From Swiss-Prot:
One of its GO terms (cellular component) is lysosome. Belongs to the major facilitator superfamily. Sodium/anion cotransporter family. In the adult, detected in placenta, kidney and pancreas. Abundant in the endothelial cells of tumors from ovary, colon, breast and lung, but is not detected in endothelial cells from the corresponding normal tissues. Highly expressed in salivary glands and liver, with lower levels of expression in brain, spleen kidney, muscle and pancreas. Expressed in acinar cells of salivary glands (at protein level). GO terms for molecular function: carbohydrate:proton symporter activity; D-glucuronate transmembrane transporter activity; sialic acid transmembrane transporter activity; sialic acid:proton symporter activity. This is Sialin. It is found in: Basolateral cell membrane; Cytoplasmic vesicle, Secretory vesicle, Synaptic vesicle membrane; Lysosome membrane. The gene is SLC17A5. GO terms for biological process: amino acid transport; monoatomic anion transport; monoatomic ion transport; neurotransmitter loading into synaptic vesicle; response to bacterium; sialic acid transport. Residues 97, 161-166, 240-267, 326-330, 384-396 are lumenal.
Amino acid sequence: CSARYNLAILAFFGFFIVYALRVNLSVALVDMVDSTGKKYQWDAETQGWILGSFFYGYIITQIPGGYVASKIGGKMLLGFGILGTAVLTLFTPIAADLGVGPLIVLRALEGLGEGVTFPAMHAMWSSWAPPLERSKLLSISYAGAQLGTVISLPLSGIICYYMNWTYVFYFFGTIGIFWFLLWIWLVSDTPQKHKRISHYEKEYILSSLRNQLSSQKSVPWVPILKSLPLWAIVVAHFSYNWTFYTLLTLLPTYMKEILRFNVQENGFLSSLPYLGSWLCMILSGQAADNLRAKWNFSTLCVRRIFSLIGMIGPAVFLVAAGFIGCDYSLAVAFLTISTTLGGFCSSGFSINHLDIAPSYAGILLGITNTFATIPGMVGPVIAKSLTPDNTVGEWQTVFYIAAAINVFGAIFFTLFAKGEVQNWALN
């Protein structure tokens, strides 16, 4: 269609692929370990490190990704940060035969690759997206990643059921490389440096970003960010990402050990949770817009209410999913509802970083994403070391810990939550 919307679609597919490369192992590992290709003997804790080293790689280069993106643009950064991942995924089946050390190193490198995508997309959209249309563009560019998580579980399940897991890794690596070719050929870095853009579209984009940049003054100097509300956002994001990443990296293992499912239905009914989460995030954005339009609530009561809902609903329904274990339908239903009630939190709290200190979105997002990726490094290891032999009580321990963390994060956020400005964001 247009030029900025063509860039959206190519970023949509890019983030789809990056989340695919993040979760394909989360399925291929439950079809990989030994209790038809090769099946290694990993001692119920090696799987924790293999699942959660990608997030070491992610947290290493979250913020330096933002710096390098502001420096040398976004196109090459995102393209190479997805190509590195979709090339190391081509070698994951080869690095598995070498052992475990090489596999953890390969996933740390994949985390290095995938930690630089969003900080580059934000620069590309600071150069492309007109202010009065930034919302739809970012919405598409990240619904890409959401649909990646939603669809990457069924495809991994199917390819692990009818074929091996090496085929999962080869298929996702090949799709990654094909999209990287499309993304080097089509997308450019800035409407000025675009090859086949039209005059009127470039003039529209530039005449809107003219105001956007001219209204910016606090860009060069960076202050200290030791304010209380920022640590509230950080603690809430940490307590939400704990549950999110624990589920992301240990839902197929759960459905194959406790609930005693297949691998195909494992993929399908492991995807359904995130499909619900995505639909709920969309509907929750709509409901938040409506509730802030018709009623005021000082723009902060809505934040704390949506955080309470989207962080306690998951906790209580996760305790429920843990309580009634070893049951086919009710357990997966409670899990689906528990992670479906996360869209409330997602929208009505991850927009609090925009509302607390605008024009500083990148900085605050960088300070939040690392301290909420920490769960990616800890959670899987802890939840696989607490349950060496899968029993309903062993997994109830994990679910209880996750729900308690959710409740604590919700309390800590709704307590010290501010929403107008913190006296260091004014230009």
